[PDB]
Point group: C5
Chain length 201, copies 5
Amino acid sequence: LDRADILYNIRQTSRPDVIPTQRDRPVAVSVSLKFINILEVNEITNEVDVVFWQQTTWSDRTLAWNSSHSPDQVSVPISSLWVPDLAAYNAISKPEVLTPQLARVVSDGEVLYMPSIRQRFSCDVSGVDTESGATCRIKIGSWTHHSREISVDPTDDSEYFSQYSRFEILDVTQKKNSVTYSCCPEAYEDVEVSLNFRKKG
Amino acid sequence: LDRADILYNIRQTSRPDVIPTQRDRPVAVSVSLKFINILEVNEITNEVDVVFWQQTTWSDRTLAWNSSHSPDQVSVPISSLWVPDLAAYNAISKPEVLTPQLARVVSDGEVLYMPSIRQRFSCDVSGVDTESGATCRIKIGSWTHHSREISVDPTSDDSEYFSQYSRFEILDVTQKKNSVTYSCCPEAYEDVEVSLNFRKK
Amino acid sequence: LDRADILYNIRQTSRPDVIPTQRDRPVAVSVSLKFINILEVNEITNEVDVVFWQQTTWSDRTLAWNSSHSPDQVSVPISSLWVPDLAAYNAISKPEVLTPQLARVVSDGEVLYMPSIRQRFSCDVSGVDTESGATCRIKIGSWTHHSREISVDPTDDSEYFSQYSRFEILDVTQKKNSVTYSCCPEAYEDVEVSLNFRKK
Amino acid sequence: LDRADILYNIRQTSRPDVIPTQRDRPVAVSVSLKFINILEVNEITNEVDVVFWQQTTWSDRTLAWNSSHSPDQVSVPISSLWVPDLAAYNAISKPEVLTPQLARVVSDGEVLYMPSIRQRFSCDVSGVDTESGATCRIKIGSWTHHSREISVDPTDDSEYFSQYSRFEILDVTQKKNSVTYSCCPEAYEDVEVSLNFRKK
Amino acid sequence: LDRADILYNIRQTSRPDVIPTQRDRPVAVSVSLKFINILEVNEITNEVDVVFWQQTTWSDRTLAWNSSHSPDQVSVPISSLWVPDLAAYNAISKPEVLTPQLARVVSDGEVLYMPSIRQRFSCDVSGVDTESGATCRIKIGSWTHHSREISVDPTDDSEYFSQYSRFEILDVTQKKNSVTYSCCPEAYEDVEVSLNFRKK
Ligand SMILES: *[C@@H]1O[C@H](CO)[C@@H](O)[C@H](O)[C@H]1NC(C)=O
Ligand SMILES: C[C@H](CCOc1nccn1C)N(C)C
Ligand SMILES: C[C@H](CCOc1nccn1C)N(C)C
Ligand SMILES: C[C@H](CCOc1nccn1C)N(C)C
Ligand SMILES: C[C@H](CCOc1nccn1C)N(C)C
Ligand SMILES: C[C@H](CCOc1nccn1C)N(C)C
């Protein structure tokens, strides 16, 4: 097998429509936000404009191939793959994906998709111009798949943060939750990412 | 049947262009707005910028399958399904869908589609900064299907999912069903009017 | 025939690229604007931002079917049928269609397409804050089909106009024109819609 | 042949990806801008927002048909034919096409494509509020085809210019150029359109 | 072979999803930015709005053809070719491509793709209104292909800068880097382009 064969096979058979659950166990999705920039904060309206890399990993065995004498990994357009239907609950704009929409697939079926996203959120901006800073909580989970189909888990904080931002990051913490909504009888998991940041002073 | 079979079958046969009327009876569509945020309000121009989950349900029997030893539900891209052609009569921007465009289909043919939408409306903003608050009325119905093809009906805490970080707060949400004949066409068109009573904190 | 058959047949045969002229006579298109809102006006720049329902009707016999024991009408995505290439000559933004892009087809081939459109125009805004108001003229016609292929004709004023607009409509009148442009030897028809409005 | 046959044949065979050079001679493209509006001017940033009809003509013999007992012309979506890859060198926004994207094809293979375009440009705005006015130069040519593959030539100046603009046109002149860039060994032709205008 | 054959063959066989690595050696991509305009420099937020031609070259042997008695080059839509997945790490808007999305392919498989791009960046704007000027660093590299699959190298770049900009370019320098990120075990190459500019 070479890359052309692998990509041909994936394109013919991946079934992007089909969640790759194994034996009625949920697909375990890991999500981790690497913050790159904070662009346009408004303490009056409690809105924030943020740029982050959304590191997203999961397993899809239907993509796997025998890597004997073959490439161990390929880059695949996400339109040819099943991707988790993650949404940020407190987003107030649709995600603007700034990078090529390619995922990386390993021969055992492990997938990494890590777009750079600019998005606007509704969150607590109070204290942004103080030494304690503001804490903006971003909540991300599957929109349509309950906890028996998709589970979501969290995997330096300023590591890739732009030095040219007007803001600086004090801390980033994660928390996993499982919530039942009035609409539906089942539980839906999310990861809440708390971004503690402040204006440079 | 597993998920792959069900989704394959739906993709091959659903007919997204065909309204699934049963025996010349209208498709009964239920619509309910769960308000999440009020983002911009302008009392001079009478305009409002709102985020809401549009809970939309209907039945399409052509999607049904025998759920014996099979999954009870699948998530399906709306491009593979018939969806009611709902529109907001007083919208002044196109709906910005913030979430993955997937519907949930139950084995008996019941569909739920519940996108998070940000949209701007023309409505009565007067009184927003008073105790009584403003009442903004949002009118939603089928754009091209009359009352014998689509009926629309309203389906909890109004502020249930409303953001605590909004500058506004919700006092009350009420619904009302209407049937209207327009000058353009001889038939009647149903709508739901959702009255959002809100004020500045 | 049921709806599924009719829509299948339309999808397989409608020919959206082909103007449905009958016997070398023009396709008669009717256009009528129902103003819903006036959102922003600028008297210095002579620009206006308007929302309207563009009621558009024409006949396409290639869509017709025998309605005996069959539905009399279906809703069809406009991508599956021929639609007149109307443009507003004084638009300064592309039309933002706010509604599902569906037309309604009757079994005899009559088509109605009626999108809600938000669009910006260059027009006379002077007098908007006076009793007489401003008169903004919007000119609409086929971009590429001359008068022997497409004719355009006009069919309450503030019937659907929003009560919450800062503006109010005093009068709406229409006028049909036929114009020859320097670029091309033939005549092109348009409808000019005159919107007389003022600040409340 | 009727319109349906002609359009069917064009759709099946036109090859929109293939430049219709004849016998290793360049495709002769004519370009002419008819200015409709000037919407915003900035003398500090030297930027202008303009609306114009871009009259573009060329010949593509692969489109030709025998017009004996047949329509002489059809309107065709530009996605179904080859179109020159023209770009404005000093544009600072992408062209916003305001009109239906249809070209008109004559039976001998002559094509006219004439979209209404709104676009922003970087150019010399100095003098706009004086009697002499400003002269904004717009440079248009093929982006990827050199002079042996595409040649570009120019074909009342205020003829279609909006009376409601804050600006007025004093003169429009054209000039053809042929330029070698550092990137590539070959020459690339352009037309430079000089728009002399001023605030009323 | 004529142009129609070559383009037909490319469309049928190019495999736009497949990186054209040769013998487990990386595809060598060359990138060079030719700055055309600087449109907004926000001294509050450290954000710049820039227009540049992104000259991008690489080799794809699967595109090659025997050029004996045949055209030496064709223009090809990028949707029909593999293109490197380059991204600007400090971009804060998606790239707005202002030009026709065509690449030029030589019979030996050499590809040139050179779009005009408008994009907004986060970078050091301090000193823009001083004699030394500001230095804005733009970092560009493959998003998903590591150093054994794609290498990136720089090929002045201010020759095409608009004379009507409020800004002027003092110097442009490039630097190649190779970086390992926390997410992934391999190294990813980038080119960092330093744009030294100031207000006139
Ligand atoms: C590929 O074939 C080898 C040799 O028999 C086998 O042991 C291995 O399990 C196969 N690889 C994968 C990934 O299954
Ligand atoms: C709160 C949201 C609302 C949307 O949910 C759904 N849409 C289709 C099926 N379901 C369940 N999720 C996370 C339940
Ligand atoms: C007011 C709107 C106008 C649009 O109507 C329609 N467009 C195509 C068919 N129909 C009927 N509806 C609800 C009648
Ligand atoms: C004013 C417009 C200009 C555009 O005309 C055309 N574009 C293609 C063919 N034609 C004729 N029409 C109505 C002549
Ligand atoms: C200056 C512009 C830059 C784009 O050029 C090209 N892109 C692909 C091939 N070529 C040649 N042209 C006109 C040379
Ligand atoms: C910083 C970026 C992040 C995205 O990387 C990737 N996305 C999918 C595979 N890979 C590797 N690269 C260059 C590592």
